[PDB]
Amino acid sequence: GKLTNGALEASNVDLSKELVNMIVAQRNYQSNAQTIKTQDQILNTLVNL
Amino acid sequence: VKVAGITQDFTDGTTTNTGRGLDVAISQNGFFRLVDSNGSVFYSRNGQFK
Amino acid sequence: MISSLWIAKTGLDAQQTNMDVIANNLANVSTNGFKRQRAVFEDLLYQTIRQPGAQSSEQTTLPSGLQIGTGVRPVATERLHSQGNLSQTNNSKDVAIKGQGFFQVMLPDGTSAYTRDGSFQVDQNGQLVTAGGFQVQPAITIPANALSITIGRDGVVSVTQQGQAAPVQVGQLNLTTFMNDTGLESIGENLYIETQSSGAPNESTPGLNGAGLLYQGYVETSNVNVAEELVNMIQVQRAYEINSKAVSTTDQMLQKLTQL
Amino acid sequence: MISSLWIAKTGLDAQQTNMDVIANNLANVSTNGFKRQRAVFEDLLYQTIRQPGAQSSEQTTLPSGLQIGTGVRPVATERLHSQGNLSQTNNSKDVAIKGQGFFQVMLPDGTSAYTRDGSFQVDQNGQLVTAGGFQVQPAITIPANALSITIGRDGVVSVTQQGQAAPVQVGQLNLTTFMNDTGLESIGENLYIETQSSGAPNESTPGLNGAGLLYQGYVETSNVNVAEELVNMIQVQRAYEINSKAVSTTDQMLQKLTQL
């Protein structure tokens, strides 16, 4: 590529995409925590026999 | 699940005028070549030079 | 040691398998080109005792005899092959399939696996490879002096060199389709290998007799639905707890008998 | 007093050790330059009974004989020497490590200890000391009328004096590297001492050889990941309850024996 003098190459991070990805990742993490909690309430129920 | 890897989106970003003569922007492909105090070779897209 | 204990010991194991399937589906909610699993169950033995339909008298038959049954067993976990939603992540090296075909990839041992993941990279030698470093087939090399990579809807890979107004074709991407997509054996790393229940690998071009279409800059996400998995967890948890209660009731019954 | 009771007692002790490791990891979240611990277990001895592979007849061997095993024992507690997150405190005296080196300090016993903590102070004598007052070899004396301290990426310490246009070098901070980093014996107060399994201390400047670089104004936070510890705590609690249930079952069987 060619060099442009007097200019800087800024970052390529789009904030809207990052925010929506953060939201969906939070929901997925909560779902995984929920199934973790279910496996225990199952192990605890088996223990209380 | 297993994390196969972490990539880096090597697409050209914004070009912003700065008004200083020592900043260079690389459109399209290319990497600036640097050497540290040890002598290793490095590559960087940041054109903020001094 | 007693019949109801074995039956409720099979119920526990089947519900644990269902929970395992649900948890595995929820863990891979973000992996591209994923197909979620579904466990199927079937009845175990049925002890005959009094035979159903047995001739009690010389003219009267016994309807629906004493058929005491055994627990449950799972046949298998089948992959729900549906089209995951496509995502526009705008990179020239990501390709997504629109139909029901598979990419062919050559394993290091010389055999060929089949993957629907479209996140492709370029190795140091210039070949298209899967993100796990497995080289794609039938080999699409990419020159060092490449300016843009264009993969069309027909799988044709073109590379535009510097200062040249015409693109250069560097290969042709083909899709493999099977009689039975479920019977493929998953070997991990988003890879499936051929099994005799999956028929034979039929190679086809993308748009003809049944291979899917390829879209560049798109990634095929998983078909896992979170809400349905949540509801299924709530129902599997209740079923497991109730079967454990059956175990406990059998245990209490055996206690009094022994005490006698 | 019975074999299963000893096995369950060993399991309980191992799970308690795991819980202590988790608690120690949790207690040192705010410590700087702390490396989390992980415990590794091994399975104990085996009562032989019938030997596996013993010749039963003149030609037929016995496959997989009665190997009744004993409980479990923890072998080791290993540190995870990984680069923790760097935190900017904007202090002229705080130093952070970027690689895999160690700072060398002198205990008042006369032996040398090694610490990765970088929160340094100056004593009333003007020397560089650790927050516990241990003097930081190979020894940096800071003059009385200092205006600012500059510690370079390679370890050169300079002091800017009033009326002098040039900085004055007052020492050189060095890093010690070990061939085996996990073999160091932790004596507390963020100090590790060398053992015979920790190789020999190789002193080097930050940048040369393999030692890491020094960042001024930064502190190395602990590498403890908390959510993993919470999940491990849940697992440890459930496993401890299961082992306690095994103990209870053994106790009940012994009780039903006595009355006979």
DSSP conformation letters of D200-226: --EEE-BTBTT---EEETEEEB----H
Q: Give every CB contact of residue C237 below 8 A, 6+ residues apart in sequence.
A: A38, A41, A42, C19
Angle D1-D5-D10 from CA coordinates, rounded to 5°: 115
Enter the resolution in angstroms: 3.3
* Inter-chain contacts counted by CB atoms under 8 A, chains A and B: 59
| CA of residue C41 relative to chain centroid, distance | 17
State the smallest CA–CA distance between residue C52 and chain A in angstroms: 37
State the smallest CA–CA distance between residue B38 and chain D in angstroms: 7
| Cα–Cα distance measured from residue B25 to residue B10, given in angstroms and rounded to the nearest whole number | 15
Q: C242 is written with which tokens?
A: 């109730």
Four-point Cα dihedral C25, C31, C32, C33, nearest 10: -30
State the smallest CA–CA distance between residue D227 and chain A in angstroms: 10
| Cα–Cα distance measured from residue D138 to residue D114, given in angstroms and rounded to the nearest whole number | 12
Which site among A24, A45, A47 would you substitute to test the C interface, given the most C Cβ atoms closer than 10 Å to its Cβ?
A45
Place of tokens 């070997």: C187
Chain A neighbors of D238, CB-CB under 8 A: 40, 43-44, 47
Q: Cβ separation of C237 and A38 shorter than 8 Å?
A: yes
Q: C40 is written with which tokens?
A: 């199927």
| Residue C131: Cβ within 10 Å count | 18
| Cα–Cα distance measured from residue C18 to residue C11, given in angstroms and rounded to the nearest whole number | 11
| Cα–Cα distance measured from residue C143 to residue C150, given in angstroms and rounded to the nearest whole number | 13
Q: Which of residues 207-246 of D touch A (CB under 8 A)?
A: 231, 234, 238, 241-242, 245
- CA-closest candidate to residue C93, choices C215, C10, C193: C215
> What's the N-to-C CA distance of chain D in angstroms?
18
| Cα–Cα distance measured from residue A33 to residue B3, given in angstroms and rounded to the nearest whole number | 18
Query: How many DSSP H helices and E strands does chain B contain?
Result: 0, 4
Burial of residue A47 (CB within 10 Å: 0-12, 13-18, 19+) is middle
Chain C neighbors of B1, CB-CB under 8 A: 27-28, 30-31
- Determined by cryo-EM
Chain A neighbors of C89, CB-CB under 8 A: none
Q: Cβ separation of A47 and D231 shorter than 8 Å?
A: no
Query: How many DSSP H helices and E strands does chain D contain?
Result: 2, 19
Beta bridge partner(s), residue D215: D96
Sequence-ordered alpha helix ranges (H) in chain D = 3-27, 226-259
Q: Is D53 left (phi over 0), alpha (psi -120 to 50) or beta?
A: left
Q: D122 is written with which tokens?
A: 């100056």
Q: Is B44 left (phi over 0), alpha (psi -120 to 50) or beta?
A: beta
Q: Give every CB contact of residue C108 below 8 A, 6+ residues apart in sequence.
A: C134
Q: Give every CB contact of residue D163 below 8 A, 6+ residues apart in sequence.
A: none
State the smallest CA–CA distance between residue A22 and chain B in angstroms: 17
Distance set, CA D44 to CA B17, C181, D6, D236 (Å) = 69, 47, 11, 20
Which site among D241, D243, D248, D249 would you substitute to test the A interface, given the most A Cβ atoms closer than 10 Å to its Cβ?
D241
Burial of residue D158 (CB within 10 Å: 0-12, 13-18, 19+) is middle
Angle D179-D182-D188 from CA coordinates, rounded to 5°: 120
Nearest chain B residue to D208 by CA distance is B38
Please state whether the peptide bond connecting residue D138 to the residue before it is cis, i.e. omega within 30 degrees of 0: yes
* Angle, helix A15-47 to helix D226-259, in steps of 10 degrees: 10
> What's the N-to-C CA distance of chain A in angstroms?
71
* Phi, psi (degrees; rounded to nearest 5) at D121: -125, 170
| Residue C46: Cβ within 10 Å count | 11
Angle D152-D153-D154 from CA coordinates, rounded to 5°: 90
- CA-closest candidate to residue D81, choices D228, D222, D201, D205: D222
> What's the N-to-C CA distance of chain C in angstroms?
18
What kind and span of H or E run contains A23? Answer: helix A15-47
Amino acid at D191: L
Q: Give every CB contact of residue A34 below 8 A, 6+ residues apart in sequence.
A: C230, C233
Beta bridge partner(s), residue C220: C86
* Phi, psi (degrees; rounded to nearest 5) at D203: -85, 140
Nearest chain B residue to D210 by CA distance is B38
Distance set, CA C203 to CA C99, C108, C169, C173 (Å) = 14, 21, 20, 10
What kind and span of H or E run contains C8? Answer: helix C3-27
Q: Which chains touch B (3 or more CB pairs under 8 A)?
A: A, C, D
Measured in residues, chain B has a length of: 50
State the smallest CA–CA distance between residue B50 and chain C in angstroms: 31
* Inter-chain contacts counted by CB atoms under 8 A, chains B and C: 16
> Beta strands C72-79 and C37-43: pairing type?
antiparallel
- CA-closest candidate to residue D113, choices D11, D56, D184: D184
Q: Could you say which DSSP state residue C189 is in? A: T
Burial of residue D75 (CB within 10 Å: 0-12, 13-18, 19+) is exposed
Which site among A35, A45, A49 would you substitute to test the C interface, given the most C Cβ atoms closer than 10 Å to its Cβ?
A35
| Residue C144: Cβ within 10 Å count | 8
**Residues in chain C preceding a C-to-N separation beyond 2.5 angstroms (breaks):** none
Side-chain-facing half-sphere of C203: CA atoms under 13 Å: 10
Three-state SS for A20?
helix
| CA of residue D204 relative to chain centroid, distance | 23
Angle D98-D99-D100 from CA coordinates, rounded to 5°: 135
What kind and span of H or E run contains D157? Answer: strand D156-160
Please say whether the beta carbons of D69 and D26 come within 8 A: no
Please say whether the beta carbons of D253 and D25 come within 8 A: no
- CA-closest candidate to residue D245, choices D3, D44, D78, D8: D8
Burial of residue D30 (CB within 10 Å: 0-12, 13-18, 19+) is exposed
Which site among C226, C235, C242, C255 would you substitute to test the A interface, given the most A Cβ atoms closer than 10 Å to its Cβ?
C226
Q: What is the CA radius of gyration of chain B?
A: 15
- The minimal CB distance from C226 to the residues A31, A38, A42 is found for A31
Measured in residues, chain D has a length of: 260
Measured in residues, chain C has a length of: 260
Q: Which chains touch A (3 or more CB pairs under 8 A)?
A: B, C, D
Four-point Cα dihedral D246, D248, D249, D253, nearest 10: 140
- CA-closest candidate to residue B50, choices B25, B24, B28, B16: B24
Burial of residue C60 (CB within 10 Å: 0-12, 13-18, 19+) is exposed
| Cα–Cα distance measured from residue B41 to residue B43, given in angstroms and rounded to the nearest whole number | 7
Measured in residues, chain A has a length of: 49
* Phi, psi (degrees; rounded to nearest 5) at C45: -55, 160
| Residue D216: Cβ within 10 Å count | 18
* Phi, psi (degrees; rounded to nearest 5) at C93: -95, 0
Please say whether the beta carbons of C96 and C222 come within 8 A: no
Three-state SS for D183?
coil
Q: What is the CA radius of gyration of chain A?
A: 23
Angle D238-D240-D245 from CA coordinates, rounded to 5°: 95
- CA-closest candidate to residue B8, choices C91, C116, C128: C91
Q: C202 is written with which tokens?
A: 């039929």
State the smallest CA–CA distance between residue D154 and chain B in angstroms: 9
- The minimal CB distance from A7 to the residues B11, B12, B25 is found for B25
Distance set, CA C12 to CA C19, C40, C95, C233, C236 (Å) = 11, 15, 43, 14, 10
Q: For chain C, where are the E strands, in sequence order?
A: 37-43, 46-47, 68-69, 72-79, 86-88, 95-97, 102-106, 112-115, 120-122, 128-130, 148-151, 156-160, 168-172, 175-177, 185-188, 191-193, 202-204, 214-216, 218-220
- CA-closest candidate to residue C190, choices B5, D251, D47, D152: B5
Q: Which of residues 20-79 of C touch A (CB under 8 A)?
A: 22-23, 26-27, 29-30
Beta bridge partner(s), residue C216: C95
| Cα–Cα distance measured from residue D138 to residue D212, given in angstroms and rounded to the nearest whole number | 17
Chain A neighbors of B30, CB-CB under 8 A: 1
Side-chain-facing half-sphere of D230: CA atoms under 13 Å: 6
> Beta strands D128-130 and D148-151: pairing type?
unpaired
| Cα–Cα distance measured from residue C213 to residue C99, given in angstroms and rounded to the nearest whole number | 6
Coarse DSSP helix, strand, coil percentages of chain C, rounded to the nearest 5 percent: 25, 30, 45
Q: Give every CB contact of residue D48 below 8 A, 6+ residues apart in sequence.
A: D65, D66, D67
